[PDB]
Design brief:
Bound molecules: a molecule of 2 linked components (NAG-NAG), 2-acetamido-2-deoxy-beta-D-glucopyranose, calcium ion
Strand content of chain A: 15-25%
Entry title: Ovine rBAT ectodomain homodimer, asymmetric unit
CATH topology of the largest domain in chain A: TIM Barrel
Number of strands of chain A: 28
Shape of chain A: globular
Keywords: Cystinuria, translocase
Distance between the termini of chain A: 10 Å
CATH architecture of the largest domain in chain A: Alpha-Beta Barrel
CATH class of the largest domain in chain A: Alpha Beta
Chains A, B: neutral and basic amino acid transport protein rBAT
Helix content of chain A: 10-25%
Radius of gyration of chain A: 25 Å
Number of helices of chain A: 13
PDB class: translocase
Largest sheet of chain A: 8 strands, parallel
Oligomer: 2 chains of a larger assembly
Structural class of chain A: alpha/beta
Organism of A, B: Ovis aries
Strand order of the largest sheet of chain A: 15-14-11-5-2-1-17-16
Chain lengths: 575, 575
Amino acid sequence: SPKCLDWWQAGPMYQIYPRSFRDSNKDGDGDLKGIQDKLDYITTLNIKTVWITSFYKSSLKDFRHAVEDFQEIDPIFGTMKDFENLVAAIHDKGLKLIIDFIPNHTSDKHAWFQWSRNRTGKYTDYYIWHDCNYENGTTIPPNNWLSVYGNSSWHFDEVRKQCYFHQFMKEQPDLNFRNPDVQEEIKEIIQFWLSKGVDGFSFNALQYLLEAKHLRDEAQVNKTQIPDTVTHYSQLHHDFTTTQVGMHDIVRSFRQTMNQYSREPGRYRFMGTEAHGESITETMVYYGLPFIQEADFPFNSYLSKLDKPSGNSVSEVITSWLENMPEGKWPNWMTGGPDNVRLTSRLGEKYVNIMNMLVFTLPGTPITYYGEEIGMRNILAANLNENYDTGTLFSKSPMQWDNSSNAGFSEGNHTWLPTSSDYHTVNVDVQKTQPRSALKLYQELSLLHANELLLSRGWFCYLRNDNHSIMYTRELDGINKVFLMVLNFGESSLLNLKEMISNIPTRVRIRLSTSSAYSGREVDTHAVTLASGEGLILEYNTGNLLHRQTAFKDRCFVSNRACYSRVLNILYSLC
Amino acid sequence: SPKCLDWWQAGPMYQIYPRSFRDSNKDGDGDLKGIQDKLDYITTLNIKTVWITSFYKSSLKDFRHAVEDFQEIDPIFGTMKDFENLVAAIHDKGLKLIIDFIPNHTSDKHAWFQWSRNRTGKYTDYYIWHDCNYENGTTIPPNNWLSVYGNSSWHFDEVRKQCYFHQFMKEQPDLNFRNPDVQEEIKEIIQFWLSKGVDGFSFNALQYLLEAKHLRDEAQVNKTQIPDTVTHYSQLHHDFTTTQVGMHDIVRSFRQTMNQYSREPGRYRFMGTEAHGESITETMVYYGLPFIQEADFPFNSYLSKLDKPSGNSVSEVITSWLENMPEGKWPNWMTGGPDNVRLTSRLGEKYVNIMNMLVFTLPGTPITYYGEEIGMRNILAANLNENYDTGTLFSKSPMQWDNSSNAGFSEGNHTWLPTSSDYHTVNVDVQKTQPRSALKLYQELSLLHANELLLSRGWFCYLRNDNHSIMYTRELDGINKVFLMVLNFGESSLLNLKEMISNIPTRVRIRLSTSSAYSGREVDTHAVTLASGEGLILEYNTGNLLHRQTAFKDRCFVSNRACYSRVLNILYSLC
Ligand SMILES: *[C@@H]1O[C@H](CO)[C@@H](O[C@@H]2O[C@H](CO)[C@@H](O)[C@H](O)[C@H]2NC(C)=O)[C@H](O)[C@H]1NC(C)=O
Ligand SMILES: *[C@@H]1O[C@H](CO)[C@@H](O[C@@H]2O[C@H](CO)[C@@H](O)[C@H](O)[C@H]2NC(C)=O)[C@H](O)[C@H]1NC(C)=O
Ligand SMILES: *[C@@H]1O[C@H](CO)[C@@H](O[C@@H]2O[C@H](CO)[C@@H](O)[C@H](O)[C@H]2NC(C)=O)[C@H](O)[C@H]1NC(C)=O
Ligand SMILES: *[C@@H]1O[C@H](CO)[C@@H](O[C@@H]2O[C@H](CO)[C@@H](O)[C@H](O)[C@H]2NC(C)=O)[C@H](O)[C@H]1NC(C)=O
Ligand SMILES: *[C@@H]1O[C@H](CO)[C@@H](O)[C@H](O)[C@H]1NC(C)=O
Ligand SMILES: *[C@@H]1O[C@H](CO)[C@@H](O)[C@H](O)[C@H]1NC(C)=O
Ligand SMILES: *[C@@H]1O[C@H](CO)[C@@H](O)[C@H](O)[C@H]1NC(C)=O
Ligand SMILES: *[C@@H]1O[C@H](CO)[C@@H](O)[C@H](O)[C@H]1NC(C)=O
Ligand SMILES: *[C@@H]1O[C@H](CO)[C@@H](O)[C@H](O)[C@H]1NC(C)=O
Ligand SMILES: *[C@@H]1O[C@H](CO)[C@@H](O)[C@H](O)[C@H]1NC(C)=O
Ligand SMILES: *[C@@H]1O[C@H](CO)[C@@H](O)[C@H](O)[C@H]1NC(C)=O
Ligand SMILES: *[C@@H]1O[C@H](CO)[C@@H](O)[C@H](O)[C@H]1NC(C)=O
Ligand SMILES: [Ca+2]
Ligand SMILES: [Ca+2]
């Protein structure tokens, strides 16, 4: 008898950017009270977890953040009581809530830093201070290290008369995780939010926690370049400021703090991490070891990087994640996020449905960014008098609920960001009346994913794939039924499935289709037609399963194998 | 009720260089059968653990080693049966046996390497192979990395037509610990020796297990130096070939393999490591974490580095180890070893006794190198027709047992190394007849250390120290007795102890003294005389202990605090 799937394994996650979900008090900024009013809509999506990005008291709301108090709410989002009412409303709905945590830096207005730049007490080495020659407005940094946004990562502080370190903007001084006073502070921040009932954290920017103690220069990517023109982050090799040797042991103490709150059954606290962008073998380290426990999964954002809808492009993201993942770990598929271009603008409107069908039929936890379920798109321009990253700001446009003032988001006259011009046709109210929309298909896949027992605990055998088409099967032993997903990223195709499967009848029934005209229509596997961005979930009966054979041992995947008993009507792991 | 001390915590360790202990078959090389004949002498020293350095089948017996078979014995030392008879003899004596393990490299005659240089099967990537331009006997290495003994660490292999990596000599190709086939091989070597009854391992050269995958050049210590004259290891910064990010996780899997054999009580398997030479904060990482288990202790060889007998020199080694050590860990004190100059030649013959008294009264496990108990010294010259390191060879001279042929070591005409000329006066037989010798005092400290309950579980308060004198106290709460160790590394001293302690009577009795004339003589703490290399263990009665006060909270140390009950007659941890 195998162990039940945890709540973070069983249902999709829904990532919300709280300043753009729903506005309650007519001021143009979303708030925690507005998320509580729309909890009913989240349960129609069969969502399991709500993931709210940062809402702490912040002096900078971008550039990975500048938090002035890790135990407070920013005023625009509400108060501490408004958050406690939201958590009670989320739990009584049967949902879970995970929140963003960034432990790397603070704001230069944090009380810890105003005490540190004065050498007040034990706060003197909460940050990384160093002597640097400064005069006439010019400073000589202790080394050639560059900030992620590009300039010397050392900044002179006139009060302390030294230089402090920052990986990000100068408003974001880096905390010193080599001393144990700072790790006790972060330990107390975790315990404060886990006490309020938060079901887990998403830790971001963990690869920047530690830097080399010797403070030696980095090696330039171009060896023969004049050292005074090195100002771009991509012009250096980052061997001393990223993923130092003691970094994963700090992450493991975060996990051990969260184990104190995850003992009682039903209240396991989730831990997730932002993946290393340029390396997938460094990402799989966060999965932990057979004897050392770490993150529950690192968030896989490699599907949200693709800017060309190709068959070989998607196929490569899938196999590379499942090949490198440790043996019995849980995959996850994130097709969009706050800092990448929305799916409709990146790939095209004809690919919205095919992409919802992909992440819901792959093995693991599908993670959904708000607006992706209705085919939302990037806004073309904005006018913001606040410090934001204009390269990534346009995917945070307010949610489109109906055809009304500000797409039914604010009920005021102004919103912090403009809504898309096509909210008259693309909105939640309109899409849930028409029979086959982007929102309707999402609700059919979310419901299918919930109660199938074949998509949640079934094997995954990835069949061959020419470009422009992806095929794979989900199957469990004692079920006598398999799902066959055919996804066509090409211009068209009329392909023969009897050649490819060799385990398929001549008449199979269509369980679901993105075009949605094939409601329950049967098809003949001799000649199946796929119209350039269409996907089918075929369902039929068979005994000879694909993973039993020796030809497919290499391309079948399962997290924890468990056969099914038609007699006893239970999963059992002995098989 | 606190947990009992393990066998590696309770008694001293005795390090034996097996080729120089005792020769059985007249061939001039010590063997495992010769160690079994002298087990009686090891129990007169009250030794708990025997530590035998490497004896595997080796093509190179120095330069950290070149092993041709990790599951065989070198012929000069005996056979597999001779080892099984030695382990049975060691256990039936009540002793433990730990052995050396080096997992970094092999010999170029290993079967794994003769299969790897031919690309035979899965052995093709057991080692680190790379393409390099070779012609006319000259080779262009893949980067500027240097071997520890100084030259390019890449060597061209004519059969494979590539370059292989070696941190040490070219006869020692480095294993590839990034693939899992090699870590399964080392896992099976550990299980093979733990099955034979070996009670633990000493892992050496663990900081060299991993190297950077990118193979980028190191940074020169002298930035403006011509790159073709960089041939010394000390001319580079070793950021890519030493202590890479995944190294401690490989050590932790070694520990987890040894936990399968350490479950039954009385048979815990010890794990020790060779310390990082130039850094003490990197050494304390091997102690592990509160939640991740690693080495039981890293071997502290900082006492064996001192080449000047100074009071401030010894005092600095002691405080730096106890300050940086994690909270409840076990210290260890190694005053000599196979690769450093013996204690008599490094400091002087007048400092042999004072150094035995130091490591036996400090808190932790004292580790003894064979010959140190009788005041052995380095030989002046040798004539070896084998590849050895002449800089460190002279501390491996054969053990001096009596005034006979070859100091009673071989019973043959030749020995692999000559014995010291002064074996007529310095030998075990002579020293155990005269009343107060180096061997006699060692047996009194070893016996005192065994059954005292104050030196094994007592606090350690390090009192003030002018140069030329070291004072410290060992005390437990419910015992009503304290030991006061006065060690004089200066030229002479007549010091007043009533000024320094303020808890001491005017008449205290001498428990032990290196000069040994003070057998049971009482002394007056008004004027105590110490003759330039003398040490006293003073013993008296008091109630107001030194660690109870607030002035000494900073300079008292204990591994696991536990008071003593005069009524119940047990240690209890609630105090
Ligand atoms: C580093 O910081 C400076 C701070 O001013 C940035 O400034 C640019 O400076 C050049 C001339 O020195 C101007 O032509 C640019 O207009 C400045 N930038 C802006 C946005 O006004 C500089 O860009 C930074 N280096 C980076 C980001 O690589
Ligand atoms: C690395 O940088 C050097 C110098 O910046 C580049 O070499 C050329 O140097 C001359 C100097 O007189 C410049 O006029 C050229 O513009 C430089 N070339 C380029 C492409 O910038 C060298 O090419 C750089 N290496 C690269 C770009 O790989
Ligand atoms: C690197 O390896 C070479 C291999 O020969 C070592 O050789 C020395 O070479 C110089 C001239 O090239 C001779 O004068 C020396 O006598 C050679 N050494 C010996 C021991 O004979 C060289 O020393 C090595 N580099 C080191 C060890 O730093
Ligand atoms: C680093 O190396 C350079 C060059 O090897 C040293 O600079 C001097 O360079 C001239 C070149 O004409 C030599 O004649 C001198 O002998 C070099 N000086 C020395 C001390 O070797 C530079 O000094 C070195 N840096 C050090 C040793 O810190
Ligand atoms: C700055 O320093 C002064 C004196 O050094 C101190 O009185 C003041 O409280 C400090 N400011 C802060 C914000 O700690
Ligand atoms: C003052 O600033 C100028 C900038 O042109 C600089 O060259 C000079 O060294 C500075 N001198 C002092 C004393 O700060
Ligand atoms: C949507 O809103 C517009 C303006 O508010 C209105 O004219 C239109 O009738 C609405 N749509 C429907 C279906 O009622
Ligand atoms: C919003 O602004 C409009 C004019 O811009 C004004 O007529 C209206 O009263 C405002 N609404 C609120 C709630 O203040
Ligand atoms: C060397 O290679 C040949 C053929 O490639 C093979 O027959 C031989 O066994 C190899 N030698 C060793 C020691 O494996
Ligand atoms: C041969 O060796 C000489 C060494 O003087 C070298 O200069 C030359 O490049 C080499 N040529 C070939 C073809 O190996
Ligand atoms: C030690 O050995 C020498 C030579 O074997 C011998 O002359 C001497 O008497 C021995 N010492 C004692 C105390 O017997
Ligand atoms: C040792 O060598 C000597 C001469 O060097 C010889 O007389 C003696 O017999 C040898 N001993 C043995 C055991 O071979
Ligand atoms: Ca940092
Ligand atoms: Ca290695």
